[PDB]
Design a protein around this ligand. Structure first.
Ligand code: HEM
Ligand SMILES: C[C@]12CC[C@H]3[C@@H](CCC4=CC(=O)CC[C@@]43C)[C@@H]1CC[C@@H]2O
Length: 452
């Protein structure tokens, strides 16, 4: 089969599509192009041909095979934010990515994933006893900021554990994400005209400098440590690999940065959306509380509990299905292949529109929020909220642990109410790199009233 999509109007076809991505935002443009043309179609970002694909088969094929273990985006943009051939998230150098990923994978599983369940709970407890730092005079909690702070404290105490300014770093991380999102697919032209991107360059420097102070302190503690054997962690493993031949200071420094931003970027907005759903679905809220009563009671949550929390697990999955944050995935073809019907050349960019896929493929009631969608065991080839395979989410397992831990410890303690008739559907969302609340609007706050 030849490839669907707009006409290559002798050099205008590319300019409209890129411009449309810039104008609409990546996610809404993907959804536009998939709805107009097929669920498998072609478009251009800068020069290069990029396939925007919703079909479950193609998705599975792509994530399954090792010759798609790359992403893409502006080299100038990725250099600007420090992700050009450096971290793992947008590290598109195959070999350098291969050697860095294992550090992340170790830290996000085994004993650290077990530690995480109590670390995550104790952190939120701390922040729920200090709700004055986040609550209004009118009782309005800034949930986005609350979550970001506990997510950061969580990430810090597990992976780095150096004292830091939560509030400041959370703002800096937000700044870094805006820059990443802004520059990821900007054309080379953009990067010439300097007073159009110095803005972003500063956000990156703010965060990078802040983290350099922390890794600096972390370095000094490692040098003077007696029992280096016992107290290992993600940041230390990296630093010791650099002390062997294995890694570069620059790369270490970006990996530590990337581990600290991950959850604040994504967990916070996911749990935010999840809380607005609990607020407007009392049917489900009850089921979850009943489960928490049965399973946990008034004991501190423990690793053994999380597998038993079945209703919440379905809620989490249905929330990510219905209202995702990470609704699309960027990949690149490293070898030629046939994919469903169509040929895909080496170097061809790919955007997997997993948000659309979860409304077109397997589920009984795709366009409404119900746990009926997860009453029958969902095959993992029709529902990839995290992705899978050799480049799937490195946090995918621990993320689920973390989300259960915070939803338990919060709902245990508080009823959550939304302002006005607001719901996830009515919130004004930006749909660019990720899918998240437009924070220049308001009515995003919530109210926390106790239980008993
Ligand atoms: C609700 C939470 C989360 C969601 C929905 C999510 C989703 C995703 C998705 C879709 C990808 C792309 C994977 C692919 O291309 O197949 C990804 C990549 C990644 N995620 Fe997450 N994620 C979450 C939380 C986390 C957390 C908590 C961490 C770390 C602490 C993390 C670390 C990563 C990393 C490092 C990658 C890049 C993997 C690579 O390129 O090699 N994620 N995530
Ligand atoms: C999925 C994705 C890679 C992983 C990204 C995701 C954007 C949101 C995000 C923020 C983080 O800090 C961790 C990685 C993630 C979860 C990206 C959108 C396109 C890209 O392929």
């Amino acid at each position: 089969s030849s490839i669907p999509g707009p006409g290559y109007c002798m050099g205008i076809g590319p300019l409209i599509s890129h411009g449309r991505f810039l104008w609409m935002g990546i996610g809404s443009a993907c959804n536009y192009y998939n709805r107009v043309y097929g669920e498998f179609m072609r478009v251009w970002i800068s020069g290069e041909e990029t396939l925007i694909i919703s079909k479950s088969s193609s998705m599975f094929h792509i994530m399954k095979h090792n010759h798609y273990s790359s992403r893409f985006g502006s080299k100038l943009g990725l250099q600007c934010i420090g992700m050009h051939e450096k971290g793992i998230i947008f590290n598109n150098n195959p070999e350098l990515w291969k050697t860095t990923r294992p550090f992340f994978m170790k830290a996000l599983s085994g004993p650290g994933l077990v530690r995480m369940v109590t670390v995550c709970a104790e952190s939120l407890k701390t922040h729920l006893d200090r709700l004055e730092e986040v609550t209004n005079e009118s009782g309005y909690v800034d949930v986005l900021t609350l979550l970001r702070r506990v997510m950061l404290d969580t990430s810090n105490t597990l992976f780095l554990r150096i004292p830091l300014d939560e509030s400041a770093i959370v703002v800096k991380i937000q700044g870094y994400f805006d820059a990443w999102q802004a520059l990821l697919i900007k054309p080379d032209i953009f990067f010439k005209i300097s007073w159009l991107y110095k803005k972003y360059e500063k956000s990156v420097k703010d965060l990078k400098d802040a983290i350099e102070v922390l890794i600096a302190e972390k370095r000094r503690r490692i040098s003077t440590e007696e029992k280096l054997e016992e107290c290992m962690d993600f940041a230390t493993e990296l630093i010791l690999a650099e002390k062997r031949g294995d890694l570069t200071r620059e790369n270490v420094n970006q990996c530590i940065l990337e581990m600290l931003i991950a959850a604040p970027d994504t967990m916070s907005v996911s749990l935010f959306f999840m809380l607005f759903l609990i607020a407007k679905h009392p049917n489900v809220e009850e089921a979850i509380i009943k489960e928490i009563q049965t399973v946990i009671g008034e004991r501190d949550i423990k690793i053994d509990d999380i597998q038993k929390l079945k209703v919440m697990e379905n809620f989490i999955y249905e929330s990510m299905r219905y209202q995702p944050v990470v609704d699309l995935v960027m990949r690149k073809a490293l070898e030629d292949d046939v994919i469903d019907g169509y040929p895909v050349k080496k170097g061809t960019n790919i955007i997997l529109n997993i948000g659309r896929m979860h409304r077109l493929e397997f589920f009984p009631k795709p366009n409404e929020f119900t746990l009926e969608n997860f009453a029958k065991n969902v095959p993992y080839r029709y529902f990839q909220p995290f992705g899978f395979g050799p480049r799937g989410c490195a946090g995918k397992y621990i993320a689920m642990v973390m989300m259960k831990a915070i939803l338990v410890t919060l709902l245990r303690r508080f009823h959550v109410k939304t302002l006005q008739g607001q719901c996830v559907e009515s919130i004004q969302k930006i749909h660019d790199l990720s899918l998240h609340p437009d924070e220049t609007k308001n009515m995003l706050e919530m109210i926390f009233t106790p239980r008993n």
